[PDB]
RNA sequence: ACUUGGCGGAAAGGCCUUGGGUGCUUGCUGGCGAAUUGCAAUGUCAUUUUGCGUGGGGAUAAAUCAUUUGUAUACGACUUAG
RNA sequence: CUGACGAGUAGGCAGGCGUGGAGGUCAGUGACGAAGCCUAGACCGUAAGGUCGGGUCGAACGGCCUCUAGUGCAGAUCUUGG
RNA sequence: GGCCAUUUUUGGUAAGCAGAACUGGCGAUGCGGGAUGAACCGAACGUAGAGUUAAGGUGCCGGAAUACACGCUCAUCAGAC
């Protein structure tokens, strides 16, 4: 379960790619404000790409929540995970990208007995 | 602007539907009588029909009773304006100016 | 509401038929306009002759081939007057113009089926009596459609092959009329007259 | 009996539009046999289904249905603004569609 | 720490709902539904069929029977909104309809008590139906829109 | 010892590479496409005919301003050409892969050339001398060929899964409503 | 105009049988066998 | 579904007609069954083609390259021959 | 809790994302495999960007509180290399 | 470094010319309409849903009446704002 939270509305789910992110390979797909005098993305014509702006902000009741309803939290070791014993169905653990496979089984065996949800239990499984 | 001479019915419908008040500015809906009472019991007015009565029977405390009301925020007319072009006079076939009693019709499409 | 709406083109106006036919193609109806060579245009003959000779001068300068194509057939004059309505450069326009079939005369899959008219397109229900009009066979012939007489010959065949049929129908309905006289005065005809039918 | 049809057949038309915009959320329906808005006041609220065939057979069948309802009338010639659950795919402009007789007013 | 632990943790205590002001209230059906009205069902397994309306239940549904000896539509709940109500009537007095309730139907061959109550109702119904001409044939038919049937013009 | 993307069985296959060969890259690609997918005996009897101007290699991608020819009617393409040096360096690799398939114990009647690719090599820079004292490059475009031959085999029959179904109660209530009627 | 039918002769020579083959030397020269077998009857198809 | 003959070329490929056979008949009066799909969620009822299996009929060739030709030609193409 | 308001180039100010390095801390992570690279796989943030899974790989590197700067790129007939 | 538009206006035959005056804009401004046009008409923009409208329009492209009503007009160069 989770908290009783309203229906999670995500006003603009599409990613705000840069203008000409596709046409050139040098122009990366990270957003930059167009600043040309002649520019048509700053000037917000019809049929051109939509800009990020504060109107697309998310609801403060359902902000930072995963689609399971828990705020994620990076967990390196067992001592970080036991800071979530009080808060099991509010936060969810997430094991970092540099934890060895001898410690992930320890962290999962602890989070199972503490009921803390891990958002990536399938990382580095020794099948 | 389009102005005219409102009857009792349109004033009553505006103050019951779109009538709000100014309380340290704070545009506040006039849902209860305690708002109008606590804000104009200095002036005799202690219910919403006391406001309507100071409107239509233009009285000694009309200025404060009018300035207590936030300006009305009307819709567009629910039947159209009745004309092809608004910006001629009501005498030439538009909308602006004095339209005396017919203002009631227009306000009952904007309320 | 029919699967195919066959339209007799005789005694209609080119633009006023083309408007309703173009709107019915864009709603999902299959329309075949038969006998397009007896279609009409308002104004006299010479007005429309000099409106076609002012269209016939408009080819490309540098290569006359790739310019505007000046079709001479009456079905193709009607088709040019139609496809300027349907937005034919899309795909919706192409799937609209593939619902249409416009012929000269009535080719023999379509002579056995009933042919409707469009009453807001007739020359007799629109034009004020006295205005001149233009049969499209004359206009197409004087700009170089070669086949008018040939189509006339086939029409001068098919009416005969229809008219005998009409007698072969009509006398039959005569017998049916006698049957509709012999069912009267019974109980069932009076009960049908009680319920309207 | 050769007929089982409990639906009025209608034709999908264009989206809600200006000359130059179009609003894909509200589709236009041309109901057969309806010519006036006073006649089209009957079909308000009645449920429309578009029915189309597909390639991959899911749920034991190849025929997939999109549902929706009539919302309001449109024009003086009996066009009907209707919304759907997922909007009609802008390729069905001229496709038949089924205005059912439920929710029944009568 | 690979992530700094925050300062405020929102508490897991759920709140109660507010005291809602929404009372239940019995349905008032439309003016064209009277017990004895011949209905035309519009959806389900028995679409197009014609059926005889009975006691209005208490779960916003209608109880209908065919009779089962005529068309094949048994005692069954049908919602009042998926139904066209025609103008014809049969007399409903003389049938002990008041046995049935919402408890009588429950999802958990066919139970024989339903067959017995079906026959008890249908004998009195057919004894009423035989008084008017052609109605026994009329209930055994189906409803279907023919060409040129405009249902905003059709008077049921 | 790494090759391209192969969807073949490495037990029944044989490979030959031949790197850094000073050939023309745009001609070796076309003779590598022309050989592709064929049986190895048809391949070796085709490449001995390209040298005699009996059959031509179809230039398809690297083919602009090539003179069209008659023998290209075998493959539908007007432009074709007879790259003798490229076909020599390809058929050397074909007899090398034939020998490497004979050393692995494979039957030389079912071999078809399955995976053959070429890709660019480090260019060999020389220099021209142009008007008004300039110098522009004059570079070789050598190739890295590689090919992998495979015994073909049949009986790859189309048995598949069961595709478990999610039919509802009101669907099986009509399906079982026909065994009481007909079936 | 539109050609609706054409009728050929009975036994064509070896100048028009050579016109219907690009390679006369490899060919089995089998042009008009099943057509010249239509004169085997009274010619009812050809009179048709 | 057989059969009988006639008509139809504008894109006939359809229309009319003869004699039987089988099936249904709501033209009229009957008997049984049709529930549980459980209060709607197309309740799956048009086809077209590709391919693969079975059965039954029919027939058993071309074209290209290479060689050649010169009434043809930048290359192809074209016309020829074996 | 209530109410109002939200175009913006040059420009001004604020809150922040990222980078190289420094003091502190998490007795942080790590050859049971750090950094890097690829990834029409996924999650979060309006966005700067952060995070995870998979492959590759081969020894170091991060979160936070502050400090410091040779700190952020599509364009300069920009430099070097390809 | 400005430009445009209405009313007033100087020079000039005249200008999409030069120079002034009041105001509005464009520069910085999107949007709906003028088929397209920086400044004309409307209306000035956080993200969405519903309703009603402005300017313009409702034969067909193009969403919306080939609506209603009284007249005029035939153009071998119509006219349509």
Curated annotation (Swiss-Prot), chain B:
This is Large ribosomal subunit protein uL30A. It is found in: Cytoplasm. The gene is RPL7A. Present with 101000 molecules/cell in log phase SD medium. There are 2 genes for uL30 in yeast. Disulfide bonds: none annotated. The lineage of its organism: Eukaryota, Fungi, Dikarya, Ascomycota, Saccharomycotina. Component of the large ribosomal subunit (LSU). Mature yeast ribosomes consist of a small (40S) and a large (60S) subunit. The 40S small subunit contains 1 molecule of ribosomal RNA (18S rRNA) and 33 different proteins (encoded by 57 genes). The large 60S subunit contains 3 rRNA molecules (25S, 5.8S and 5S rRNA) and 46 different proteins (encoded by 81 genes). Component of the ribosome, a large ribonucleoprotein complex responsible for the synthesis of proteins in the cell. The small ribosomal subunit (SSU) binds messenger RNAs (mRNAs) and translates the encoded message by selecting cognate aminoacyl-transfer RNA (tRNA) molecules. The large subunit (LSU) contains the ribosomal catalytic site termed the peptidyl transferase center (PTC), which catalyzes the formation of peptide bonds, thereby polymerizing the amino acids delivered by tRNAs into a polypeptide chain. Belongs to the universal ribosomal protein uL30 family.
UniProtKB/Swiss-Prot annotation, chain C:
This is Large ribosomal subunit protein uL13A. The gene is RPL16A. GO terms for molecular function: mRNA binding; RNA binding; structural constituent of ribosome. PROSITE patterns: RIBOSOMAL_L13. GO terms for cellular component: cytosol; cytosolic large ribosomal subunit; nucleolus; ribosome. The lineage of its organism: Eukaryota, Fungi, Dikarya, Ascomycota, Saccharomycotina. Its main location: cytoplasm. It is found in: Cytoplasm. Keywords: Acetylation, Cytoplasm, Isopeptide bond, Ribonucleoprotein, Ribosomal protein, Ubl conjugation. Gene3D superfamilies: 1.20.5.4280, Ribosomal protein L13. The keyword Amino-acid biosynthesis does not apply. Present with 43300 molecules/cell in log phase SD medium. There is a cross-link at residue 175 (Glycyl lysine isopeptide (Lys-Gly) (interchain with G-Cter in ubiquitin)). One of its GO terms (biological process) is negative regulation of translation. Component of the large ribosomal subunit (LSU). Mature yeast ribosomes consist of a small (40S) and a large (60S) subunit. The 40S small subunit contains 1 molecule of ribosomal RNA (18S rRNA) and 33 different proteins (encoded by 57 genes). The large 60S subunit contains 3 rRNA molecules (25S, 5.8S and 5S rRNA) and 46 different proteins (encoded by 81 genes). Belongs to the universal ribosomal protein uL13 family. N-terminally acetylated by acetyltransferase NatA. InterPro entries: Ribosomal_uL13, Ribosomal_uL13_CS, Ribosomal_uL13_euk/arc, Ribosomal_uL13_sf. Signal peptide: none annotated.
Curated annotation (Swiss-Prot), chain E:
Component of the ribosome, a large ribonucleoprotein complex responsible for the synthesis of proteins in the cell. The small ribosomal subunit (SSU) binds messenger RNAs (mRNAs) and translates the encoded message by selecting cognate aminoacyl-transfer RNA (tRNA) molecules. The large subunit (LSU) contains the ribosomal catalytic site termed the peptidyl transferase center (PTC), which catalyzes the formation of peptide bonds, thereby polymerizing the amino acids delivered by tRNAs into a polypeptide chain. The gene is RPL6A. This is Large ribosomal subunit protein eL6A. The modification N-acetylserine is found at residue 1. Belongs to the eukaryotic ribosomal protein eL6 family. InterPro entries: 60S_ribosomal_eL6 (IPR000915), Rib_uL2_dom2 (IPR014722), Ribosomal_eL6_CS (IPR049633), Ribosomal_eL6_KOW (IPR041997), Translation_prot_SH3-like_sf (IPR008991). Keywords: Acetylation, Cytoplasm, Isopeptide bond, Phosphoprotein, Ribonucleoprotein, Ribosomal protein, Ubl conjugation. The modification Phosphoserine is found at residue 11. One of its GO terms (molecular function) is structural constituent of ribosome. It is found in: Cytoplasm. It comes from the Eukaryota. N-terminally acetylated by acetyltransferase NatA. Pfam families: Ribosomal_L6e (PF01159). GO terms for biological process: cytoplasmic translation; ribosomal large subunit assembly. GO terms for cellular component: cytosol; cytosolic large ribosomal subunit. Present with 37100 molecules/cell in log phase SD medium. There are 2 genes for eL6 in yeast.
Curated annotation (Swiss-Prot), chain F:
The modification Phosphothreonine is found at residue 69. Keywords: Cytoplasm, Isopeptide bond, Phosphoprotein, Ribonucleoprotein, Ribosomal protein, Ubl conjugation. It comes from Saccharomyces cerevisiae (strain ATCC 204508 / S288c) (Baker's yeast). SUPFAM superfamilies: Ribosomal protein L22. The keyword DNA-binding does not apply. Its main location: cytoplasm. Component of the ribosome, a large ribonucleoprotein complex responsible for the synthesis of proteins in the cell. The small ribosomal subunit (SSU) binds messenger RNAs (mRNAs) and translates the encoded message by selecting cognate aminoacyl-transfer RNA (tRNA) molecules. The large subunit (LSU) contains the ribosomal catalytic site termed the peptidyl transferase center (PTC), which catalyzes the formation of peptide bonds, thereby polymerizing the amino acids delivered by tRNAs into a polypeptide chain. GO terms for molecular function: structural constituent of ribosome. It is found in: Cytoplasm. There are 2 genes for uL22 in yeast. CDD domains: Ribosomal_L22. GO terms for cellular component: cytoplasm; cytosol; cytosolic large ribosomal subunit; preribosome, large subunit precursor. This is Large ribosomal subunit protein uL22A. The keyword Ribosomal protein applies. It holds the Pfam family Ribosomal_L22. Belongs to the universal ribosomal protein uL22 family. One of its GO terms (biological process) is cytoplasmic translation. Gene3D superfamilies: Ribosomal protein L22/L17. There is a cross-link at residue 45 (Glycyl lysine isopeptide (Lys-Gly) (interchain with G-Cter in ubiquitin)). It comes from the Eukaryota.
